[PDB]
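Bench log, entry 3. Co-assembly request; chain sequences pasted below exactly as received.
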Amino acid sequence: YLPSIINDVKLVFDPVELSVLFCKFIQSIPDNQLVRQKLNCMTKIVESTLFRQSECREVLLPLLTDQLSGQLDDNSNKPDHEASSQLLSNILEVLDRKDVGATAVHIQLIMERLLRRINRTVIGMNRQSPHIGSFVACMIALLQQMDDSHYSHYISTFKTRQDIIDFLMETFIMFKDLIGKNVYAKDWMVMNMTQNRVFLRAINQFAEVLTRFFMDQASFELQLWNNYFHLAVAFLTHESLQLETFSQAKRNKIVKKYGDMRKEIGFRIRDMWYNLGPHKIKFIPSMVGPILEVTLTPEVELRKATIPIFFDMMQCEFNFSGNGNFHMFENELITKLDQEVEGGRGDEQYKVLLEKLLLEHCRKHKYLSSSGEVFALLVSSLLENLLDYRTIIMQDESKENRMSCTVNVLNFYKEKKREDIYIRYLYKLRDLHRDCENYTEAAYTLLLHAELLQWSDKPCVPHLLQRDSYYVYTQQELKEKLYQEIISYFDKGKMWEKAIKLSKELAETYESKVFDYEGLGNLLKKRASFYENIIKAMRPQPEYFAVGYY
Amino acid sequence: QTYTIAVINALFLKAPDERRQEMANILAQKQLRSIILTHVIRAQRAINNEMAHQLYVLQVLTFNLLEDRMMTKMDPQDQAQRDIIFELRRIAFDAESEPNNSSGSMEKRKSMYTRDYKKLGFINHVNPAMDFTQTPPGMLALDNMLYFAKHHQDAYIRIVLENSSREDKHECPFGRSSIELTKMLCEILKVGELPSETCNDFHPMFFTHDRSFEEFFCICIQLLNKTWKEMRATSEDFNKVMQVVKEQVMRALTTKPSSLDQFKSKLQNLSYTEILKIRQSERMNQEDFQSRPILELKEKIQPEILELIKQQRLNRLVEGTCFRKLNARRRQDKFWYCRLSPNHKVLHYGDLEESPQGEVPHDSLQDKLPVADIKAVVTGKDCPHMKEKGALKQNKEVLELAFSILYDSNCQLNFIAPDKHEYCIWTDGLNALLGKDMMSDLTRNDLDTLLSMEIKLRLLDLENIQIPDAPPPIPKEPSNYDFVYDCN
Amino acid sequence: MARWIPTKRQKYGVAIYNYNASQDVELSLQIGDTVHILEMYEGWYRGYTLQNKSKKGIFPETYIHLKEATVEDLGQHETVIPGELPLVQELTSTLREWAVIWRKLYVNNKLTLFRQLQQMTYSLIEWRSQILSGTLPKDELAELKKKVTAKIDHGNRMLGLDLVVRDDNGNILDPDETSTIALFKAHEVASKRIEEKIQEEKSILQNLDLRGQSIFSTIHTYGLYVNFKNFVCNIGEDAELFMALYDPDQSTFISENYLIRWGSNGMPK
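Structure output for the full assembly:
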């Protein structure tokens, strides 16, 4: 009840004197006592006579900052969290009201003693049990209420370069934690986009500070862009045209009140990367993967602005394809396109605009452009194949057409010798046949997969593995596993000659390569059983009908 | 329990009815009602469709055990019944009737008849027992009022003295209310009717008492007095008012409560709005269309919304329900289904064991209907398979569950449904399947609201304004055909 | 078609009824359409429909309906009671979106919650109508506004639709980047309204004793309604009616009586 008098005390007293008197009082609390209650006291204070800011701000906010900073890490503060959040809430709420006077510097101080502080605090509050949203609020309010002037003033101007880089570690990792697994129930579209707005602005400011202090001029210690670009992309990867579509005006809503963030985010990305200059070669195999999800956003503008970035990175790699090629880009490029476009996110006009831009790039530069031209043809083919594939996939359910198209693209990949997605679709096929309950053809697919593998005791490649199960896996272990289910299929396929043949080679491989005689016996006695089935069982003869298409 | 209860039904099938009452008394002395209540009326496993049949048929057993004693006529010359009603309306009218007319004269009896039936709406007081010769129900109305005089005496005498103030046409005839209500509720229940094996809906709210329908009638006659005072209706519309009221009581019954107390709640709940609520909620369409502007535009909306209705029925049928196989009373699986292919040019149908998951998508037993070739829907009786019914094999309600689309150009796809709204569903589904007009009562039932919704949302711009049918005069377009500021 | 004079006043109008298809961009358009009449002319004004701000039509002033409206709630005063024009205009917008979504709530054969949507829809149109009858005093409008926000957020919840803000006078007026903390406060208190609303819907969904408890627990100023019609008895003298209150338990009485001169034959003196 002591603060409950201050508003009328001021009316008959020196407000500064009252303020410092309360300061002298409260500062004297033995820290082992009555924490949350003294915080409530500070709240009841900060509500009132802080409207009379211009005289008591400079003498309380120091003190209040001190108490909160002490509250920062006392290792038992879990109930203190809610109360301290109330304090931050109320101080910022009063500081942002427009009838308070010049407060920029006082913010600046609150900033200077609590930014990384509450940032670390929420970095502790990562468990989704407490009132996370309160501190997330206080965070965003701190960083939007403040000004770029303040960052540049001293937040950019903290202590030693290594320390500030560690601080940046902290900020970017915790952001990337924020963009994923939003702490708000996603129903708070207002609040969610506000948070996106403020985070975007903060990231802009950090873009300037990175540019300022971490170019080739600071040739040293230049990895952070990993974290940066990853943050940018993960941010960029929601609030997409479907979401704004959900009303005609929903689009118009997010546009009018906010614009479409993606454009400026991508623009910052692209010119950040341009300014990166002579070191992009350190990024291609990594960062090609991210930049497609921006490349593939259903809009037109930033897509048109973005497409050239692939060309820029590949021709920079041409500066390193003076020795060799740029394949050590296009391989993973293609791979990423495969995953994403099969995910269901491409467009045909995407490839059209692609064609236009890539052709611009080719018809600018010399002979490497001819190479890139034929590779652009490869990319085209790739696209329209995936496009037709997808458009058929989820509509007819005609397993015949599904098999037909997937094997079309499998054949194409075979021609383009991309064994990896080859295998991917081969396993898609085994599942497709399983759901069709067709066994001979499923076995046949399994074979043509297996026949890539050889009988060398060297586990040459893990890339050939599907990512389901792997330990050391000398190739023969996988080959014999494959054969186990293959012969299982040929059994349940009720066709045997190929089965007994595969038994022949599996048996010889056992006997003269691994000497696992139990397996020898098992498979050979099963082969004998298959022989007797051949004789005893009946074989119906399927009839062959010729089907023209016209 | 299905087996044993159906055996009990069998004991009730071909026994002399007096020995039906003897064995009914045996059941009551064991109180089979309550023991069945605690065991299987508390069973929460897959309660048999044969339980559906058993509950219905046991209700019918009770019902006919009342029927065989009610169809006969209580003679209006029964001096025994003269004494019976004498003491009954003693304990009823003993507030207007002295306790002395127990020792009194038949002359005071006739005077009490005339006064208490000019206050309870009877036209004759020299032969008062004339209204006792129409069964439904006859005597059981007197049994009703007996048992009410035994138990509900407070509200009983309250009825007796509350009818004692209105001598205009707002007076309610307890005798005539009783006869009317009892016979027509008998008809709504179809009390004591022949075995209908397709009746799989039942009345647990009366599996919980022995005089359940008696006390039901009294609680609903308090409902009656409430309803009379709801409209303040005269006795000229006595038949009109109470027919409407029992329409509402049918609504309350059809809400299907499974407890007596919940239906008492419903006796409270049915407001005078319910008397008019939906029966006039079908009319907002016609007030909308009485003026042209709603009327004159709506006629282009239907293809959108009729398409919606038909295609919604289609989407229902794509999964589809499981019909019943004809006369599989000899322990054959009745619930056969028919799947509507997402292609909708073929059907997938057959009979299996009961599937609480609905239909199992599989290439069914016989798996075809050429939608193009198959043409004619024999809507109900027109099925040649059941065209031979006389009146006993099929009656005039199964064809509202049964019909066929032809098939093979020779044979019928005989149909059955658990109920009739989904009969409407399947009908208009197959109906749309040919590009031909919708013939479900629910179709013309639900266009209104959805059409009403579209028009009301379309008129969100036209509030507190007036328009006539006559359009305003039309100015002319001058020949400066390009803009100052061009398009876009 | 030339001679185009613009003014922001006209950018928002509607039509009287169906049009005619005499010319090309003059087709028999719909009855009520907020159209973009950007520019004005002698005989026919421009029009860019709600459904396409770019689709063209030169419609006549005569067939412009009673709407020269604008985004200005002040000018024509066909925005009769400004400030509540917001609430009603987003009221209309949300009703349109509700109708759209439940239109495809058929295969969501949720006829239960579908029909509650229709109930809320009728309730909403009649509520808005009463608001358009804005002759009412201020407290009624306040309480109506509060329960309107309630029903809107209700629907958006079960419909899986976004939350609105700004408890008072507009449901939206926050976006002004007023205060992220105030924004959080509004969001949290409204969300609490949301879960408490779901649980009070389940409360009021089966039995309705708790509503009696609540309504009789807010304010406790009660009186006893002696809904007397007739006295069923006869004493012969001026029998005098004295009601009163007594606790069977506290062994003490509560209120005081009232004399009623009832007559000597069960009639009133």
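Residues 180-206 of chain C form the longest helix (27 residues). The longest strand of chain C covers residues 240-242.
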